[PDB]
Amino acid sequence: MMNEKILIVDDQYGIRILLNEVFNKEGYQTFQAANGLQALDIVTKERPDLVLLDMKIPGMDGIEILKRMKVIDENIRVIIMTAYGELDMIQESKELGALTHFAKPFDIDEIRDAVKKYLPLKSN
Numbered sequence: 069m070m071n072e073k074i075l076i077v078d079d080q081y082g083i084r085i086l087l088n089e090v091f092n093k094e095g096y097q098t099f100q101a102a103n104g105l106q107a108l109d110i111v112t113k114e115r116p117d118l119v120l121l122d123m124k125i126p127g128m129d130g131i132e133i134l135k136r137m138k139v140i141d142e143n144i145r146v147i148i149m150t151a152y153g154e155l156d157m158i159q160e161s162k163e164l165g166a167l168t169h170f171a172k173p174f175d176i177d178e179i180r181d182a183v184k185k186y187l188p189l190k191s192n
Contacts, residue, residue, distance in 0.1 A: 073116030074098035077107045079125045090176050104133050123150040
């Protein structure tokens, strides 16, 4: 009765903040990441069920990160905040473990909406 953990992987400033306050009042313990190693660490320390992976991180493709998440837990969810760009491992990444695929500019309403349908909160 306390698996409301989340990992917001975003290096660009603006998403880790907006997505934060949003999941902060709605009732969600989201974290911050971007280097990739920080996301996997918080994932092995708390083991959240929602992970926001962004392909914008200008340092290393997050394609490997998703792999580690599939090697540590198969019931892990991850969304792609970059649908407006390319689509190589995104298609297969879907059936793999990519719940939805958000892009930019996105709407904080569509992000919290998909997060609510996926992870159900306590009764009301």
